[PDB]
Amino acid sequence: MADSAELKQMVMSLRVSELQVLLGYAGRNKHGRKHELLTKALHLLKAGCSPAVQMKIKELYRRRF
C-alpha cells in the first residue's frame, strides 16, 4: 500500500545516481542536475510510471534509510 505522495517525497530523497536508475530502469534519458532529474522522475509519476519503478524508489530509499 502507498500513495502518489510518498513516492514523490521518497524520490525527492534520491540522489542523481539513484535518479539515473529510475530513468535508466524506465528507459528515460538521464543527464542533468538533481532538480532536472527529479523533475523528470516526478513527471514520470504524473506521466504514469509502472509500480516497477516505484519499487526501486522504495529500495533506493530503503538502503538509504
UniProtKB/Swiss-Prot annotation:
Q: How does it assemble?
A: Interacts with NCOA2 and AR. Interacts with NR2C1; the interaction promotes its sumoylation. Interacts with DDX21, CSRP2, AXIN1, JUN, UBE2I, SUMO1, SATB2, PLAG1, TP53 and STAT1 (dimer), following IFNA1-stimulation. Interacts with SP3 (preferentially when SUMO-modified). Interacts with KLF8; the interaction results in SUMO ligation and repression of KLF8 transcriptional activity and of its cell cycle progression into G(1) phase. Interacts with CHUK/IKKA; this interaction induces PIAS1 phosphorylation. Interacts with PTK2/FAK1; the interaction promotes its sumoylation. Interacts with DDX5. (Microbial infection) Interacts with ebolavirus VP35; this interaction mediates the sumoylation of IRF7 and contributes to the viral inhibition of IFN-type I production.
Query: Where, if anywhere, are coiled coils annotated?
Result: none
The organism encoding this protein is Homo sapiens
What free text does the record give on domains? The LXXLL motif is a transcriptional coregulator signature.
Which residues belong to the signal peptide in this entry?
none
What are the residue boundaries of the SAP domain, all occurrences included?
11-45
Per the entry, what this protein does is: Functions as an E3-type small ubiquitin-like modifier (SUMO) ligase, stabilizing the interaction between UBE2I and the substrate, and as a SUMO-tethering factor. Catalyzes sumoylation of various proteins, such as CEBPB, MRE11, MTA1, PTK2 and PML. Plays a crucial role as a transcriptional coregulation in various cellular pathways, including the STAT pathway, the p53 pathway and the steroid hormone signaling pathway. In vitro, binds A/T-rich DNA. The effects of this transcriptional coregulation, transactivation or silencing, may vary depending upon the biological context. (Microbial infection) Restricts Epstein-Barr virus (EBV) lytic replication by acting as an inhibitor for transcription factors involved in lytic gene expression. The virus can use apoptotic caspases to antagonize PIAS1-mediated restriction and express its lytic genes.
Using the record's annotations, give every residue carrying the modification N-acetylalanine: 2
Output this protein's name.
Answer: E3 SUMO-protein ligase PIAS1
The sequence motif named LXXLL motif is recorded at 19-23
Q: Which residues of the full protein are shown?
A: 1 to 65 of 651
Q: Where is this protein localized, as stated in its record?
A: Nucleus; Nucleus speckle; Nucleus, PML body; Cytoplasm, Cytoskeleton
Q: Which family does the entry's similarity section mention?
A: Belongs to the PIAS family.
Q: Where is this cross-link: Glycyl lysine isopeptide (Lys-Gly) (interchain with G-Cter in SUMO2)?
A: 40, 46
In its record, the post-translational modification comment is: Sumoylated.
Q: In which tissues is it expressed?
A: Expressed in numerous tissues with highest level in testis.
In chain numbering, where does the motif Nuclear localization signal fall? 56-64
